[PDB]
Structure formats: structure tokens, C-alpha cells
């Protein structure tokens, strides 16, 4: 059930006395004339902070519970209006709807409305007033306690008839402090254009006139992104489809540059035997950039070819092309046993940077003789025809892999559909802004991309995918001004949105902006 809150729920924001002065403040307050939720109990959200009230004549409401769990999984604030005194605790309680321990803090202290605010470190305010369904009458709540406890409060309950709840919005208030230091009246500046006017003037009386109060600005309704069409894909499409894929004893490479590096196609690659990216993760690498990809390939028996990493130490990679620790980059692999293998399997090619381990087919490894030029028994060449069996799967059989470390090897720039005639954010290439993009007559030369104004600011764009010129207007904004008779005469007001078109917000389009609430007249005075 719901009911209008009227003006109830103002409280002394801070601990200071003020004379008969109008004080402006920012705090968590019950917005004027908002809905209280009325109850006649369930656990509820605390949200930002809670106004609460009831008319329980026989002190029927006995207390409250607050926390995240309201159960022994963590601590919870308990409050009870016991018959002798107020009692407060913070134990890790465990109870049902109402009871009828790590207790790190404790404290003790229908004719009527009993009325409170709970806030958060935690604080309470109250008032207790006679009543005749909330009164239309105004009275602020005095502070009642502040507790050092700092409990995580997100929900609350009630312990025990009619009672009310409402949520403290962040709000700007003007408060009428008075001769005894008391608050006698209040405004809620956000309520209506007259309440903005009262707050702007710092006054409860407002004279006949037109007053500025705020800036109206149309917000951008979405973000549009545009780039030229993708073209000139990376040579990866040939590399990972090469039946002639390089032997690790004779590894080979090329600079992928001036290309669309479509690494997203590898990121999603359900057929890939592996991916080995020691640099950027492939989801980011699909949008990476570098001067070129250092793209290079090798193949061996799968379990030995698994040694191929930057800063790795495996003997097979030492015997082929083992990368330095500075070789962080992208990598990918394929099942060579299914196609790259010969009749002898991995014997199709010389087994495990390109030739960077001083690797060649001559004498290499073994200190058994002075390395006289026989590639066998004198001083073994390690990278002979690979040992992986043709009948095995590509871990026991042969496997092939390639990799590339990082101004011209560029990932694809995705673009949105275009939008027209709406205030939106726009990105076109490196140009960013916020505006109403509109189709236009303004022709300009084939190499050119932008408009300009005389003030050297962006004024138009060529769309990079259908070469029309879009004239750009900023998102409409202007002053808000409140026309008013004196409050002494009426509370009725009319709003002028300066220089706006009434489409953009009775209503009247004046020559100075859109006027609201005022009636047009053909007489003159």
C-alpha cells in the first residue's frame, strides 16, 4: 500500500546552532510529497537510508533489526525499545520473523506519531508528536544517537498495527532555521520549478519576476562508432593452411605488415590445436597494433614441439628455434599428423627465433670428436627427420605451430550502424564528440574528412563507409528560467527553456525558447 509523505522527514543535518537564517544543504532526505510505503512484518531493503514512522499507542512496535543477512552468517544491528530503556547490540544473531555471538558493541539509554530516521558510522534522529493518514503539518527530527559501529546495512526488519517506510534520496534542501535554533520550514529544491526558484534565491518569499534556476541539456541517447571498411587481411590465412608447413630444423618467417590482423578469427578458432600467446590475450589481440607481426613457423613431434615458448628451455626447441624471453607475442597450432605427415609420419621434415639457436643441418651438438664434417657420429646434427609415428594422434604424432611478436599490423576496428537526427555520442576514426548528426548539402573535396567552423572546431564529418557529409549540431542545451507572479499572490509558475525547440523537452514556442505552463494570448498589454 502507498500514501503521500507530504513534508515529514526533515532532520537537523549537522550539530550546529544557526540564528533566524535560511541554510542550504546537501544530504539524504525524504523527498517532499513522495510515496511512503504503508504497512499494517516483512524484511525490507534499507537502500541509502530509511525514514520510519507509526501511531502505535500502546508502544506496539518494540524494535528493529538491520544488516545484510539478518542471520548468524555475519553481524547484524539489533535495536529494542525495552520498557525500562533503549537497548542496542551488534551480535551475529540467528532468529525467525521475531525472537520471543561476536557482540562487538552494545549501548543503553493514535494520540501520537512516533517518528524516526536511520542513516549511515550509523546515526538516528527522532520526533514524537500528537496526531488525529500522516499529518500535513511540519516538524524536523532532532538527533538521537551516533554509533561508531560501521556495520554493513543493506536490509532491515521490524519487531513488535499501522506503520510507514520511505527512502532518503540524496537531495538539496533549503532549511528555515529560527530564533531558538529550531528548523521551522523546508523547501526540497528538486520538487518543482518554484522550489528550484526558492533555493536559488535562498528565500521562502519570491517576488514577481523571471529567475534563472538550472541548465537544461539533452543527454546523448547512444554512442555511434565508424571506421573505413576492413580490407587487406593478414597472411595468417595462407600460413595456417600451408601443407608445406616449415620443418623446425629449417624454420621460416615473414613480416605481416600493412594488414588487417584478424586475430579474433583465431580467438574463436574451434579447429585450432592450441594457442600460445605470451603477449596480449587473443580477445585484446583481435584489437591490437604493432609495426609488424614477426610471424614464423615450425613443426616436430607434438610432445617435443610443445617446447616452443619465449624464454623456454626444452631440448627440441634448442635443436630448432627456441625464442628469447623478449619474444612474447601471439601463437597458434594445427594437427600435422592428419595432413603434414609423410609415410614415415614426422620423418617428412627435419625435427625440433627462426634458426636463432645457431641451428643448421651441418655438424652441431656433440663433443665426442673435434667436429670433423660428418653430420652423424662425429658431432651429431640433432634436428634429423622427426620421430613421431604416422598412426598416432598429433601429440604422439607430428604437430605444427607458428607465432609472431609485435604501426601497420592492425586488428579490425568494429563499427556500429549509423544514426541520424538524435543527440548521440560519435566516434569517427580518431575524431570523438557528442552531437546531433544530420545528413547535409555541404560538399567537400575527396581527400578531406572534416568540416570546421570559423572558431576552428569540428562542424561536419564524411562518413567513412557511405561518403555523405554529416553536418553536426551540438546536443541542444540552454538556460532554464522560471516566470512567476510573487509567491505572495500565487504558487503557480511557468518555465522557459531558453533557445530550445519544444520538440526537445500547456506549451508555447516563443522566439526566445519553449515556454511551459503559460497560456498564449493575442491581446497586448
Amino acid at each position, epitope marked *: 500500500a502507498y500514501t503521500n509523505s507530504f513534508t515529514r522527514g526533515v532532520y537537523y543535518p549537522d550539530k550546529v546552532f544557526r540564528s533566524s537564517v535560511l541554510h542550504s544543504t546537501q544530504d539524504l532526505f525524504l523527498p517532499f510529497f513522495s510515496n511512503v510505503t504503508w504497512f499494517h512484518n516483512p524484511v525490507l531493503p534499507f537502500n541509502d537510508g530509511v525514514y520510519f514512522a507509526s501511531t502505535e499507542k500502546s508502544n506496539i512496535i518494540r524494535g528493529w533489526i538491520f544488516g545484510t543477512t539478518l542471520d548468524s552468517k555475519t553481524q547484524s544491528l539489533l535495536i529494542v525499545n525495552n520498557a525500562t530503556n533503549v537497548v542496542i547490540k551488534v551480535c551475529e544473531f540467528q532468529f525467525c520473523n521475531d525472537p520471543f555471538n561476536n557482540c562487538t558493541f552494545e549501548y543503553v539509554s493514535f494520540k501520537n506519531l512516533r517518528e524516526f530516521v536511520f542513516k549511515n558510522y550509523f546515526k538516528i534522529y527522532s520526533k514524537h508528536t500528537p496526531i488525529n493518514d500522516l499529518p500535513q503539518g511540519f516538524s524536523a527530527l532532532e538527533p538521537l544517537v551516533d554509533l561508531p559501529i560501521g556495520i554493513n546495512i543493506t536490509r532491515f526488519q521490524t519487531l513488535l498495527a499501522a506503520y510507514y517506510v520511505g527512502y532518503l534520496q540524496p537531495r538539496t534542501f533549503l532549511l528555515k532555521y529560527n530564533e531558538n535554533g529550531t528548523i521551522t520550514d523546508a523547501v526540497d529544491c528538486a520538487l518543482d520549478p518554484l522550489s528550484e526558484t526558492k533555493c536559488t534565491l535562498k528565500s521562502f518569499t519570491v517576488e514577481k519576476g523571471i529567475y534563472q534556476t538550472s541548465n537544461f541539456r539533452v543527454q546523448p541517447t547512444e554512442s555511434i562508432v565508424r571506421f573505413p571498411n576492413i580490407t587487406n587481411l593478414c597472411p595468417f590465412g595462407e600460413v595456417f593452411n600451408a601443407t608445406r608447413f616449415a620443418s623446425v630444423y629449417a624454420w621460416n618467417r615473414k613480416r605481416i605488415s600493412n594488414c588487417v590482423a584478424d586475430y579474433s578469427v*583465431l*580467438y*574463436n*578458432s*574451434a*579447429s*585450432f*590445436s*592450441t*594457442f*600460445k*600467446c*605470451y*603477449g*596480449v*590475450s*587473443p580477445t585484446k*589481440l583481435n584489437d591490437l597494433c604493432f609495426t609488424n607481426v614477426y610471424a614464423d613457423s615450425f613443426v616436430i613431434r*607434438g*610432445d617435443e614441439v*610443445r*617446447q616452443i*615458448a619465449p624464454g*623456454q*628451455t*626444452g*631440448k*627440441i626447441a634448442d635443436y630448432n628455434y627456441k625464442l628469447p624471453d623478449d619474444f612474447t607475442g601471439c*601463437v*597458434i*597450432a594445427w*594437427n600435422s599428423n592428419n595432413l603434414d605427415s609423410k609415410v614415415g609420419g614426422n620423418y617428412n621434415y627435419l625435427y625440433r627465433k627462426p634458426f636463432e639457436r645457431d641451428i643448421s643441418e651441418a655438424i652441431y651438438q656433440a663433443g665426442s670428436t673435434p667436429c670433423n664434417g660428418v653430420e652423424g657420429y662425429n658431432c651429431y646434427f640433432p634436428l634429423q627427420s622427426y620421430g613421431f*609415428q604416422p*598412426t*598416432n*594422434g*598429433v*601429440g*604422439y604424432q607430428p604437430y605444427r*605451430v607458428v607465432v609472431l611478436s609485435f604501426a601497420t599490423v592492425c586488428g579490425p576496428k568494429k563499427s556500429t550502424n549509423l544514426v541520424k537526427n538524435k543527440c548521440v555520442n560519435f566516434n569517427f576514426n580518431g575524431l570523438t564528440g557528442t552531437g546531433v548528426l544530420t545528413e547535409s548539402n555541404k560538399k567537400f573535396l575527396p581527400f578531406q574528412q572534416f568540416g570546421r567552423d570559423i572558431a576552428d572546431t569540428t562542424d561536419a564529418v564524411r562518413d567513412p563507409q557511405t561518403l555523405e557529409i554529416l553536418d553536426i549540431t551540438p546536443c541542444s542545451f540552454g538556460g532554464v528560467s522560471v516566470i512567476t507572479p510573487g509567491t505572495n499572490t500565487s504558487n503557480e509558475v511557468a518555465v522557459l527553456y531558453q533557445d530550445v525547440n519544444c520538440t526537445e523537452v500547456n506549451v508555447f514556442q516563443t522566439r526566445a525558447g519553449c515556454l511551459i505552463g503559460a497560456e498564449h494570448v493575442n491581446n497586448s498589454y
Partner: antibody
Amino acid sequence: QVQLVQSGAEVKKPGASVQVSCQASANTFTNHYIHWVRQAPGQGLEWMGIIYPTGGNTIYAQGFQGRVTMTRDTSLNTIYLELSSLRSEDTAVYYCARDVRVDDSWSGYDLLSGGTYFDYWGQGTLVTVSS
Amino acid sequence: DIVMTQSPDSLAVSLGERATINCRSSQSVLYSSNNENYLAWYQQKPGQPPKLLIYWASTRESGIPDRFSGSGSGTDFTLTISRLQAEDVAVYYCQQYYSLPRTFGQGTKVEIKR
């Protein structure tokens, strides 16, 4: 440790079809090459194949390359299971084996590492020889 | 290929004595980059999918079989049986972190002599 489980237990026939299911979570779903682990009830189970369960990137043991199939489902907290032309051991129970995660800062499908050795197992969903 | 396979299929240990369940690969498991021993022992109930409990050929899981647990040795490995002939008498085999075709042996049994 892992959310390992097995499901869909039924009769399946040699040379004919079979069906199954398994449960997955955390690094065994998206950070390791999990094993499909199965055997005839006379022994502890072994790898029918190795699966990277996000996107499913797959390799099989050559006795079960045709006879058994597995599918990606890691975001569904799962792995899908099937068979066709089933082995003579068609009564073999099976479950997911929760592979140990990628041990270094490489990125993409980790099948370049590990084997059917795993930090958890789905206890084995039963089977019977439908022939 | 790796050939991860078990040796005894069953034990017959004396009560209060010890024995080992044994297993091996064919070659190179202390792999050349680090000698980082790419094997571990699965132990579980008979007929189950494999789970590791003697981890990384030199370590053990949280609440692992301990007196029934064990370690690698070159191409070979063992799980122990010190007073473990009953209750800790699991089905056990070594398995490889070594490769894609690598998998557990057929769950050879720790058990008491009869």
C-alpha cells in the same frame, strides 16, 4: 574441488550409439584441457579424449577417436557426451576428469600442455552393453 | 609415445608392514626443460574416473592417502602401503601431465595378503 559429476547412465551397444553427460566449473571448464575419463568396470578409467570445454577445442585417444564423442558446454557448467560405432567395452562407465590449469602466462587454448591427469573426477556415470 | 601403464595390478601386503603399487611411462617423464617430472598418482574407488592424490610426483593432496601415497623415480613411480592394507587400500595408477594421449593406468589395487 571442481564441480565434477556424471549423468545419463544407460545401455549402449557395440557398433551402435551411446549417450552421456558430465558437470564442470572453474579452471577445469575454461583454464585447462579436461579429460573425458571412461573404462570397462574391471578397471580404473582412462582418457577417451582431451577437451578445452569453452569452445570445446578437442583431441581424442586413438582407440576412441571414432567410438566416442565429447562437446563444449563449460559456461553451461557442463560437458556434453555421446558415442557412435561403440567399442566392445560398450558397458564402460564414464565422467569428466577436472584437468589442472595452465601453468604459465600463455593465452588461448591450452591443449599444448598437460594430459588426462586431473585434480577431480565426476565419480563415473554407469553403462551396460546394449547388445 | 608416453605409454603411462601400471605394473602389479594387485598387492598382497602384510599387516603393519609396507609394499608399493608401481607404474611407469616408457621414456623421458622428467622432461628436459626443468626435469619437472610430468606425472602424478591417481587414487580412488575401483572403476572410477581418475583423480590425482599423490600430486606432481613428489607431493600430496589435502587429506591425501599419505601412507598409501607416493612419488616418481625416473621413467617409473610408486604409491606406498605402510600399514595401508585396508581402508587406505585404494585403486591406484600413475598418470601423465606429459601429453594429450597420456592418461591413468587401470587402477591397480593396494590390499592385504590373504
